[PDB]
Amino acid sequence: MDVLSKGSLKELLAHLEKTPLEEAISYRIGTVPYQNVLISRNEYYNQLYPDTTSLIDGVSREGQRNVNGLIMSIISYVVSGSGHYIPNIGFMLLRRSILDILTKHDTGLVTNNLNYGIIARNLTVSKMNCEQRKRMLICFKLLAYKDGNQNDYEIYLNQNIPLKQIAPNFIPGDMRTVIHNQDQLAIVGIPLTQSTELSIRDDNAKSYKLGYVDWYNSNSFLRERSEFNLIRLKDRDTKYGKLNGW
Amino acid sequence: MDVLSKGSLKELLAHLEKTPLEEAISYRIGTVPYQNVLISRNEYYNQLYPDTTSLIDGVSREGQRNVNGLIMSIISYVVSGSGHYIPNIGFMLLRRSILDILTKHDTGLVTNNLNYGIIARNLTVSKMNCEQRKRMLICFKLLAYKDGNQNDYEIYLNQNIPLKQIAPNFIPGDMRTVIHNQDQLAIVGIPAYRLTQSTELSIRDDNAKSYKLGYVDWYNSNSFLRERSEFNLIRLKDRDTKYGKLNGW
Amino acid sequence: FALAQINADDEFIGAIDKESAEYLDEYATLARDISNSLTLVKAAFGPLER
Amino acid sequence: ANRATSAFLDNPHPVGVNYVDEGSRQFVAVAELLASKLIDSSRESDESNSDVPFVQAYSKFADDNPRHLRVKTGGKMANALTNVIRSYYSINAPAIVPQVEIDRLASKATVSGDMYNSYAIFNSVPIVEVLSPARTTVSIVGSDRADVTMLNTGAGAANITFNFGQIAETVILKGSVPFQLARLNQPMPAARFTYKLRPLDGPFIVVLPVGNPLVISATAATRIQVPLAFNKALVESGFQTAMNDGLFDIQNVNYYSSFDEFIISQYHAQDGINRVSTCVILGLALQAYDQMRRALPV
Amino acid sequence: ANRATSAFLDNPHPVGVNYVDEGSRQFVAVAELLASKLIDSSRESDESNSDVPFVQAYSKFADDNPRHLRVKTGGKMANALTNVIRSYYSINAPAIVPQVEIDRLASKATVSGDMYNSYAIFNSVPIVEVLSPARTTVSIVGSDRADVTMLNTGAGAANITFNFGQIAETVILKGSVPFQLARLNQPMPAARFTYKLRPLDGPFIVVLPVGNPLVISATAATRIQVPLAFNKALVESGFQTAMNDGLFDIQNVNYYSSFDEFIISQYHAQDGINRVSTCVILGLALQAYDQMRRALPVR
Amino acid sequence: ANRATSAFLDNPHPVGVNYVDEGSRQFVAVAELLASKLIDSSRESDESNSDVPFVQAYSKFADDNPRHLRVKTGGKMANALTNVIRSYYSINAPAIVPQVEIDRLASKATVSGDMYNSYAIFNSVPIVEVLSPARTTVSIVGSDRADVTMLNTGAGAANITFNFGQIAETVILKGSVPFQLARLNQPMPAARFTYKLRPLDGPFIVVLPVGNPLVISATAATRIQVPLAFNKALVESGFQTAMNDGLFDIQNVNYYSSFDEFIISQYHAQDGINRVSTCVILGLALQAYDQMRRALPV
Secondary structure (H helix, E strand, O other), X not given: OOOOOOOOHHHHHHHHHXXXXXXXXXXXXXXXXXXXXXXXXXXXOOOOEEEEEOOOOOOOEEOOOOHHXXXXXXXXXXXXXXXXXXXXXXXXXXXXXXXXXXXXXXXXXXXOOOOHHHHHHHOOHHHOOHHHHHHHHHHHHXXXXXXXXXXXXXXXXXXXXXXXXXXXOOOOOOOHHHHHOOOOOOOOOOOXXXXXXXXXXXXXXXXXXXXXXXXXXXXXXHHXXXXXXXXXXXXXXXXXXXXXXX | OOHHHOOOXXXXXXXXXXXXXXXXXXXXXXXXXXXXXXXXXXXXXXOEEEEEOOOOOOOOEEOOOOHHHHHHHHHHHHHHOOOEEOOOOOHHHHHOEHHHHHHOHHHOXXXXXXXXXXXXXXXXXXXXXXXXXXXXXHHHHHHHHHOOOHHHHHHHHHHOHHHHHOOOOOOOOOHHHXXXXXXXXXXXXXXXXXXXXXXXXXXXXXXXXXXXXXXXHHHOOOOOOOHHXXXXXXXXXXXXXXXXXXXXX | OOOOXXXXXXXXXXXXXXXXXXXXXXXXXXXXXXXXXXXXXXXHOOOOOO | OEEEOOHHXXXXXXXXXXXXXXXXXXXXXXXXXXXXXXXXXXXXXXXXXXXXXXXXXXHHHHXXXXXXXXXOOOHHHXXXXXXXXXXXXXXXXXXXXXXXXXXXXXXXXXXXXXOOOEEEEEOOOOOOEEEEOOOEEEEEEOOOOEEEEEEEOOOOOEEEEEEOOOOOOEEEEEEEEEEEEEEOOOOOOOOEEEEEEOHHHOOEEEEEOOOOOEEEEEEEEEEEEEOOOOOHHHHHHHHHHHHHHOOOOOOOOOOOOOHHHHHHHHHOOOOOHHHHHHHHHHHHHHHHHHHHHHHOOO | OEEEOOHHHOOOOOOOOOOOOHHHHHHHHHHHHHHHHHHHHHHHHHHHOOOHHHHHHHHHHHOOOOOOOOOOOOHHHHHHHHHHHHHHHOOOOOOOXXXXXXXXXXXXXXXXXXXXXXXXXXXXXXXXXXXXXXOEEEEEEOOOOEEEEEXXXXXXXXXXXXXXXXXXXXXXXXXXXXXXXXXXXXXOOOOEEEEEEOHHHOOEEEEEOOOOOEEEEEEEEEEEEEOOOOOHHHHHHHHHHHHHHOOOOOOOOOOOOOHHHHHHHHXXXXXXXXXXXXXXXXXXXXXXXXXHHHHOOOO | OEEEOOHHHOOOOOOOOOOOOHHXXXXXXXHHHXXXXXXXXXXXXXXXXXXXXXXXXXXXXXXXXXXXXOOOOOOXXXXXXHHHHHHHHOOOOOOOOOHHXXXXXXXXXXXXXXXXXXXXXXXXXXXXXXXXXXXXXXXXXXXXXXXXXXXXXXXXXXXXXXXXXXXXXXXXXXXXXXXXXXXXXXXXXXXXXXXEEXXXXXXXXXXXXOOOOEXXXXXXXXXXXXXXXXXXXXXXXXXXXXXXXXXXXXXXXXXOOOHHHHHHHHHOOOOOHXXXXXXXXXXXXXXXXXXXXXXXXX
16 A cells, blocks of 8 residues: 555655565465455346456466566565465565665576566556556566666567666666656545446555555554554564575 | 225215216227236236236226126126226116115116125135225125015025125115114325335236225325315315215115 | 616626525534434433323 | 146236225224234233233224124134235125225224335246146156246257246246356357346246156246335234135136245236236235134134 | 348338327327426526425426325326336337326316427438349448448449438438439430439439549438427427436337338338327427436436 | 358447546537537627627637637547547557546536436347358348348248347348248248337247248337436537547458447447447437537647
């Protein structure tokens, strides 16, 4: 809910630096990602409404234990607000922040073999709005410059002309580009009636939209009560035990 | 609507004396009775609601051109508010009052051969209510005393016990009996319950409800006579007097 | 024959009649009072006999 | 070829046409509401250590105060409710209660006689026909759970046709042993224990192998629109009470084990929609009757 | 000789003879006016985000105030209109609407019940009969535009006669190839592509030379007196809604693809003048039915 | 056996999945309302010999005053409406209108954005498949009125099966000569000129005698939920303009001669309910596009 309200590249990057990977992942099994299902939308139809599940719905789904699974969960969190279920990630990765997973080499994750075309297909980029595509391209560009695969990012953009039109105009190394960026990446925001939408993505997105006004006021006190005497998880000092399976 | 509002034997008989026979008959062709039909009742169902047309509905229906049909139309008007389509009766008969047709030999109509069994069967009596049955028994009693068939009327009542229980008690030639009678014969009136503007499934119930809501509109309109406010404005002939009695009674 | 002209321009603020609006709102307070009073009497005084 | 049918679905008798209008519907709603207060007045009397709550409840229901030398009967409303129930069951029953009495009793409490603001589930399984070929015995037993016993004494497998009507919403079939069932002009699937089917789909063919008998249990669910005050448990008890008291004792009518069978049998008549509305109003009247007579036995 | 005819002109079923007096036509006129205001109020409510304009219009139409948990169906006026529409369509349909109800609803507004203020143009092409010799094949397809396919198999040229009735005012014939058409006992002009014919002239003879088939496209226009509030677009939509809603399912009746075919078929029958008057009233009622149903919908 | 299918029902392309939320629906309804005011203002300006009514309307629509030297295009609202039309048609359209632009444009006028408060009738006739035996020729022509031409060349009469889908409400069949049609496993009636059918009833068999060809003309009506501002006359005209203006020139898409064929074809695809809602929004957008471009040609 907080990641969706960020409307600037500066605010989105600042949030990712503060947020650990734990809130990008989820601990709920969910269902299989791609599946033709019939859902009940009684506000419109007596019959069951056909739809296809995906990873863009704000609902947890099963993900494999690999770098592709971790990347998909991070992007889904940015573009949808809810991550995926990757089993037993490990303490060392969960304590790192999202941006360091995307842009730093000390995390212990190899991302040199990522295929951008396959990730977009798996994330169903076709059923994404303008804001979501921009956020996905920000994550792609950060990974591309981290591993030196800047050429592959350009090849992917050239193959997808519509994405090339709305691509972000920032260079990950430079800071002048981030300061002067003028993109609008906000998905949720204060304005809508308490009604139901037909699609799973549209219904879940509207649920975040209607709950943002209430979340703006109620989160302050309830949060502060939780970590009144709690040590911050992000970059927590430890004995640096091990990283298993990566 | 006016006939269905009468609540006593005095008012009902007084109204029949004033009104002519042309009110009992209708000049609209209508449809035929005893026909299974599918009607549209959309407030309740999407499909078509089955029902059966009868002579007791408030809609005009084609009737037979005989004395049997004429009597059925008169009783239908009394118990339902509308009559049947029997044209070319003749202006001599149409000018006379409904009461005169029922209980006077001077009109010229011959009703001795009429049988109360088929008339009650045709004017479906298993579908009537208590008030409708009482009015029909009044018409039968008036006819029976016209042709001197009092014994036949009694035997018919003794055959059908429920009709005997609700049969009005009055002698057609005596006015004291009409005054003493305290039966309630009103089919429409101001309702103590909550009357809404909603449809009913049956043809009989829907038409009856239309008359009921129509009477409320007429009761509150300018055509109604409020006795407590304008009793001095009515003429002396039509003013309520205890000495008043039906002609020939 | 001697009809009097009636003007209510000063009573209306735009298209809103303040006095009529406040007067009608007082029936809501009376409605709450009626319900509260009836319930209290029924609780304090149960079934009544004479 | 023989055909078999459910016993309770045979020859539904016509229902009454009186006491269906708005005023009469509100009389039944008032009678149900006031009879309910009668039962609850007993618990109030226990808590209050006095009979005053019961006296108030009976005075409103009967217009007369209770007496110690008289057996409490309910007065005019009890008499009106009893006679009105009789008229509903058969068209041969007299309509004795006057309209004026109905309107006066309907003004006692504020209600709306809307009988189409809710629904109920009725579990009587309708088997209109079961067509079997020669050398095959079919027996239908039961009304709430219908058990069909099938025996094939012939040389080869037989095809038996089921017809569940066009009214029931769902029917679930559970067999003693796995069997094959399919719609007309459809291929048969692998043998399964349970089938869920919509009667509107069409007649169903079940393959009967030669050997031990095959028994199929049928359970059906039907939705009928009823008033919000409807309670199936009270209606069912009222049906048995009225039958014992002889309110249904009239010539040329049929007798049913439960109100579930009565309403479904009437719904499957030639024009069953006409009789469903009257049957539901009879249900509310029976629910009022059960409460009234249990509080005031006679 | 072989004979062919239009499919939609075959056996026009009789129409109703009820609710055709001054009061009933006034009631149908009032229903159309109040239905139109119901549609407009629903639009005004939507652009204004207030239910007040719709509630007031529904209160006039249904004589009752809308309440939640109760479905808005139009009340007694909708019930009377639906059953009256059935009665107009067929003589087998029952008459179950009392006269006191018609009079009450007619008084709700002050409009004239006259149904002959204006006219309308109807596009159905009536082909009563097409007679051809033994060695020829004729097929007639269509109602808004009739395609007559003629094939000559014999050696000699054939003469085919066309009858267009006496009701249509003009008929325009266009051929795939130029052809010859002339009235009875008249010389045949040079082959042309189009002809403009008045059906009252008489049967028309068309020469069919041996060879490739000749196809004639027929377009007709006829004028029928209708009330000034008559809108053809609304009537056609109401005709389809009534057919889909199932209120034209009466015994021994014919079914048509449009109100255009229905009114023309009744016109081309015995006592066709009297049938057209009843059908015009049914058309205005269908206009009221369409507007009322769109304002208050069901799923 | 041969199969005959209507041309317009073959391979419907996927529709766009963007700009179908409540905010985007409100923007389309706002655009229609302001486009209608733009047309009326032009008529008022011509009648009143003044430019004041048109300047006010154009300023509200385009957020800029009209200028004599500059061209009148409609401003950003025209560009947004043009782009969403492309996005509605195909899933491969760029969909490059920001959310912030849509919200600011939906706040100009107050509309509910509800696309389910009314209905409209669409006249395209769906003929999914016509199954014919050997030595028979079947041809289907037309989409608003379908003519099925059938020729029999075999020894005896042939049975030809018609499948009208499961979505259309009613189908009316009128033949050139009287013919016989009946449902599956039903006796055939006498020859008749006309037939009224429900597509849900099932496949229909037509007996084709040996001899002259038989032509059956089909007409169907289907009900689809649309907004109260929906106008079929304006939608169809706007559909032609968008095709002429190249808004539908996308790769791997189908083309239709009318909006009626487009919506019915998408209805009959696999899970067609998913696409009807988006197609109705496109229709309302095409209504606004028609009125705007006619007032401000480009």
